[PDB]
Design a protein around this ligand. Sequence first.
Ligand SMILES: NC(=O)c1ccc[n+]([C@@H]2O[C@H](COP(=O)([O-])OP(=O)(O)OC[C@H]3O[C@@H](n4cnc5c(N)ncnc54)[C@H](OP(=O)(O)O)[C@@H]3O)[C@@H](O)[C@H]2O)c1
Lengths: 1102, 75, 76
Amino acid sequence: MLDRELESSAPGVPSVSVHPLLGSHVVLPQEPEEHLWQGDVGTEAHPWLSDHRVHQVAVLPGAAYCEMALAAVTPVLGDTGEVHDLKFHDMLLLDDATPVWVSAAVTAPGTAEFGVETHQSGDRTQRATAVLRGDVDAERPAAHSIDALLAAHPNRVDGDELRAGFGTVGIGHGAAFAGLSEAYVATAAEPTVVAAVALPGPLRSGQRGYTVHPALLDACFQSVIAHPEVQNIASGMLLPLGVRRLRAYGSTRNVRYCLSRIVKADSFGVEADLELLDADGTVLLSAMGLQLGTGNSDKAEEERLLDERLLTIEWQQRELPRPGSWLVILAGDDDENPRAAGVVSALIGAGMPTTTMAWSHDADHDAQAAALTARLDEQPLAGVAVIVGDSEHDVGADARRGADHVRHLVRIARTLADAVGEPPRLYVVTHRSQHVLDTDEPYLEHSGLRGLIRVVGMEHPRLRATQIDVDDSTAHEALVRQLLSGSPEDETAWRDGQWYAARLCPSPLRAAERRTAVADNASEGMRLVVRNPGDLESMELVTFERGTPGPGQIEVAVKASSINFADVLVAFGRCPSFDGRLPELGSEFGGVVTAVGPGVTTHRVGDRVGGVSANGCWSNFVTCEADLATKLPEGISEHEAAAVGLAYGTVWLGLTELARMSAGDKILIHSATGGVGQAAIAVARAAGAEIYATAGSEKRRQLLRDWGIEHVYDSRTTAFADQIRTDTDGYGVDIVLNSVTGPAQRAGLELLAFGGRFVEIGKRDIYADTRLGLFPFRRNLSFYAVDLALMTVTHPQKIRDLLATVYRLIADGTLPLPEITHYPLEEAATAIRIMGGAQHTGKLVIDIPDTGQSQVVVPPEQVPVFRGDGAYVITGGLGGLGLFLAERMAAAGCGRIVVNSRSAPSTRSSEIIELIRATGADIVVECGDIAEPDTALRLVAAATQTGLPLRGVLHAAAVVEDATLANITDELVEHDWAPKVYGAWNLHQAVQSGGPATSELDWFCAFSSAAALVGSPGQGAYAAANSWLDAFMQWRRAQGLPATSIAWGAWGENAIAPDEGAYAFEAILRHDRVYNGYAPVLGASWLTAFAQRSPFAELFLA
Amino acid sequence: MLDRELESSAPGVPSVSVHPLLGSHVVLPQEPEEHLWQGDVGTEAHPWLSDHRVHQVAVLPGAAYCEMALAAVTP
Amino acid sequence: AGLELLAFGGRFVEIGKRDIYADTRLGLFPFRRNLSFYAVDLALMTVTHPQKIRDLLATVYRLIADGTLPLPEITH
Ligand SMILES: NC(=O)c1ccc[n+]([C@@H]2O[C@H](COP(=O)([O-])OP(=O)(O)OC[C@H]3O[C@@H](n4cnc5c(N)ncnc54)[C@H](OP(=O)(O)O)[C@@H]3O)[C@@H](O)[C@H]2O)c1
């Protein structure tokens, strides 16, 4: 194909060569040399770009702009060049089409500002920026010895093995981004990484006109993570943020290795320097100063892990599906069970030959066990139904009986396991054992038996250990229906004629699963805010900690705040802010000073003031700075100053202060039936300015005609421009108060003439970087951006004097106040629905609830868990978990912690208490056995003694004596059950028995174990002691007392870590969820084994 | 060449079709829809343009701008 | 670059006519800090509002004659 090359040197189809990414290049007709490329970085355009994806979404890698910059040097600065200070900003998420505009302009000689950006929906978004340099000297780094380098680095990291680990943090590298074959390292001291990279087959064909392929350059950035110091330290989501210097010394076609070097390695990020080598070891590209940090914070990682780790049992309303001999055994003979009578009659009624056994307590258990084993070998039976005797309200008694009930189930369970033939199906029937319907008050006794049947279903799965929770009102005809249907659910319940089925699942919600309360309106802190903007039904009243003000601040008792159009957007998430953080609802207020912070001479207590703050002014109490409040004149009230403040302010500033509104000059006021619009009409009228106004609604336009203003146009058009131009004989206006956007924003500028004063109050267009054409400014115009909100922060003394003059001007009566529609704080949602609909006219005021009336509030993470003004108790606090939380609680700022354990302080524990007592806070140690009642009273009395009320309890007390079903003794059950359950009832009783000191506690938590939920074989006794305690906690909550239970996994000092549980504990205490299950899940062996055996864990298999 | 096309079905040079006069086209990232072309109308690029000359000097005929306008309609 | 420089107070006084008559699309994003752009064309003002120019000359001739302002390097 020589012929082919000599053939080609002859014709010409009209085309031009372009870069794959950058795209079509045009140079702008303007001095200086300004360039502009426009190219698609879409997934349909460049399929290969879909293989790099974050959280299952294709995004543009850093390396993609690295190339874009490197490319852009040679066309701008016709020479060899470096790319300086390359920064990436927002993460470009890709679609089938994603157009991007690269733009490089010369600024100084051999220097050019480089910039990548994307325009969608009118919002320009700068995705990457740099400087380009062509004046730098070619100081080619010395070539390395590829083979020698590999000798110094023997520790081989497989590429795949590293790319699997990437997918766990959320970064996916598909087939195209699999270039990194392997990386060789040495130790944490040696800071280098040899990486054998290569461009994949699909892309070696598509190398086209790349300086360096982004897929390849990204493959070298992957190699930086292979380093041991990087794996050890920054063990989170690492993303590239920029590169200080990027130079290509030639063709990166033939690049087989990358030589990385770590500069700095920190928890925040990793700086590194790279060198792409060929087989000869000669440097082809040097990316020196690559920064890889973490935007996706270490706090959001914890929050996300916590959510995947929690488990709770949920009940589904189910129906009995589809379509042998039986034995109905009892656990109490002196108690006559109508359930056992009615079930034996319904099985014989259905046509099954059913026998009966009366195994009771205080009986010859060895003789009755032999009698049972004889009945099994005598006749082959399908199933065995174990009915448990009912007390037929005292918990103290149900806790003592609960042991005798468990011990009795262990004796029955051991005989059914030791069967010659096929063991029959076990159906344990309990009376209101656990909580299913929200209305239920659980009947204990049987509460502890759900842990044993869960352990028996795991140890001996031949007999499918099923549980059936039953109530009094239900009918025996429907109960036997379940026994003969043979459904595989191992945990079920019955309430009335409906049937309920258990199913395990993670549910870390924060809506109804959040703390609730009732608070006074005159006293106690209550703010109003949306939990998730967009939904107005999500508008909640929330409580806050009303604190002492100062220094140089004030706490104002609000009588009335306003509803500005700002406050509407915020509700819908549509609000722009320089801060970035979505502002808090309500800007201005009208109230009275409650407390003046140390130390200010201007403000005094009891003064009627009006101000601004942010921090949520739709509340009973607002803390504002001294700078941001001003005393009200005798002429206006708290409700009158609430409406006026920002509207008249924004207008005063705008028209008289900036634009210097003269008399007679023509002013345009967009949407003049609104708040700021009425205020505009007022000052424009005072001033004598000829008003030209707009409105969207014809009702609201005829409303402006009724206000004696001719020259009313549609605000939702660009017609007003040419309508006003005709209605002014081609003169146009003088001032434009521009609330309106885009074509209507540009149209206003085009309208006003010579005098030309454009007051832009509308943020949308500025925070979208709408590039306004300067041409009309040829007539001596003046653009004025306004952001009062920001001024409140930058120059608050202006905003103070502005609020002050508008309160004076209106109180004097210089300006008349506008349409004020008062609303109750409750119906603040409806104001937004109306204002959002544009139905309203003028200002809407929200009246704050006066009078000590109660309102249901919602404390989120303002819950005072660890507080100095309260006392704490920690049973089992001299070892293991309980002692770790005692050190963390003192550290968290707690006053008086009474630790306890039956054993005296251990030697390493006595050393931990010495160092904690020296560091401020006190750790009172009170020995005793929580099983004895006097011990729990002694602990409470000790914690209160130092004039501090009891604000929290923890139950880490436990005894773990594990054994297989065959060797679980009656004595061993008492040792595990006694501290777990008898300590809870004593701790419960001590709190009620105590005076007002203990009738104020915020929480009461019990440290259970996930082996109760799962059924770890060998636990049994310890698993049953926990199940009762999980139900007791739910009973304590039913009565009204606070109660919490956390089923903990496997602790360190794959597995639960020490600091992992402390943060998890504090999270769970702040929420109103009663039962919690913190345990490792991932793809464990015990979970995959449990999911396939029973349908309780159906959602885990997936 | 069926062969040359199959072996070239792998290393393809990135190029794009353009108008002879208008040339390279870019739509600016701004409202309203604003387009922009840059192109050569020189005698080296378009030899035939040297044949139209006013007072012995080569000039762009009126007809060239007609074509440019007609071309710019559809995009 | 000059617009991007000024902060909060932000008072950009463009006396230079080249970029205005060129219809340069000026990115509005820097204005988020309460900036203020002022176009100045005394030449046009002399026609549209000659009284303001009369007073503007009269006030500088007064300030410079009073000595309030010192005159600059003048080369005849
Ligand atoms: N710091 C500042 O820069 C600052 C401070 C406060 C206020 N302002 C601005 O002033 C403007 C008006 O505030 P305001 O509360 O005093 O007046 P407003 O009239 O109370 O606000 C509602 C107005 O917004 C217009 N509108 C446009 N699109 C709308 C939509 N999707 N939904 C509802 N209404 C829509 C309506 O115009 P029609 O009459 O045409 O239907 C309506 O009259 C806002 O842009 C606000 O941010 C600026």
